[PDB]
């Protein structure tokens, strides 16, 4: 079937029946902990079946998702107890709308055959991104304690001063981020700049040299530093002071990483954050 979860209440019985599938919903679980401290993405959550749902699809409002090329601001969020009813349920086309280029995110790497199955009845190509997810010791202890100082080197305070992202960082964040570069992925750390606290460190004349952000999953993303500023365990200090932020707020801390990536691996591991055993998946959806 289909149902629209509406209200605190239900989105806490939606975490509590997550908590169980963790870390394989922690795409969904950190979605769902956002939208109830205050939805600043305008999302919602469907269900196969309540209370005993099966499978979860949080996407986004319909009126919101006027440009078709904006694979930004068409995600969903998935996570499922049985692979066929997850195609049965992602097969609806008011969970999603495959005529648009859409991003699928999800902690399961399992739905990879859902998503191909689809890609042949519903006419797209599917380009698949996956990496090592990490989460923080302490949100590891938190969540799935079965599973289980980390503060980075000292800076010279007079040189790099932790603010926060300013909207007119946008850019440089968009040019250093491995999924951006054009105007949709602008408008998308824009809207993360405004709905969330993100971290940066000053240098000369308020430029930003490193920089953490997190998106409307919750994760951290879209960290990075200036070529020239690298190596002095800058970006170590955003990510630090932004995961000290949501640890306080009693938010889940995570983040991933390309294997091929030694460099913010050995980052990671400096903060304690351990890679898990449930890849990050996206898969980037258009048609034919």
């Given at each position: ?10 989105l806490q ?10 870390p ?6 950190g979605?769902v ?7 600043p ?9 309540w209370?005993?749902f ?13 440009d078709?090329?904006?694979?930004y601001?068409?995600?969903?969020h ?21 005529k648009?280029?859409?991003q ?6 399992s739905?990879?055959?859902v ?5 042949a ?20 202890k938190?969540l799935t304690?079965s599973?289980?100082?980390g ?6 305070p ?15 964040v968009n ?5 951006g ?10 809207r ?5 606290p ?12 490193s ?8 994760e951290m ?9 690298r190596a ?5 200090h955003a ?28 980052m990671?591991?400096?903060?304690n954050?351990?890679?898990?055993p449930?890849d990050?998946?996206?898969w ?5």
């Open positions: 079937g289909m149902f629209l979860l509406q209200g605190a209440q239900m019985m939606l975490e509590k029946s997550l908590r169980k599938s963790l394989m919903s922690l795409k969904v679980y979605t902990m956002h939208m109830n401290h205050g939805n993405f305008n999302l919602k959550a469907l269900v196969d079946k209370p005993d099966q499978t979860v699809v949080i996407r986004p409002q319909e009126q919101d998702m006027k078709d090329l904006d694979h601001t068409n995600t969903y998935v996570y499922s107890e049985d692979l066929k009813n997850c195609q049965e349920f992602l097969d609806l086309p008011e969970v999603i709308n495959w648009q280029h859409l699928i995110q999800s902690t399961q790497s739905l990879n055959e998503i191909q199955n689809l890609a009845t519903k006419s797209f190509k599917v380009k698949r991104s996956k990496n090592i997810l990490y989460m923080a010791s302490e949100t590891i938190e304690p599973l289980l100082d503060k980075p080197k000292a800076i010279d007079e040189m790099f001063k932790l603010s926060s992202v300013d909207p007119s960082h946008a850019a440089v040019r250093f981020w491995l999924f570069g054009n105007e949709r992925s602008l408008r998308f750390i824009e993360c700049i405004q709905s969330f993100n971290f940066c460190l000053l240098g000369p004349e308020g430029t930003p040299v920089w953490s952000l997190m998106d409307q999953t919750g993303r879209m960290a990075g530093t200036l070529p020239e500023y002095q365990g800058l970006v170590t990510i630090y002071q932004q995961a000290q932020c949501l640890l306080k707020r009693g938010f889940p801390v995570y983040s991933h990483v390309d294997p091929k990536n030694q460099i913010m691996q050995k990671s591991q400096s903060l954050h351990v890679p898990m449930s990050w998946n996206q980037n959806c258009e048609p034919l």
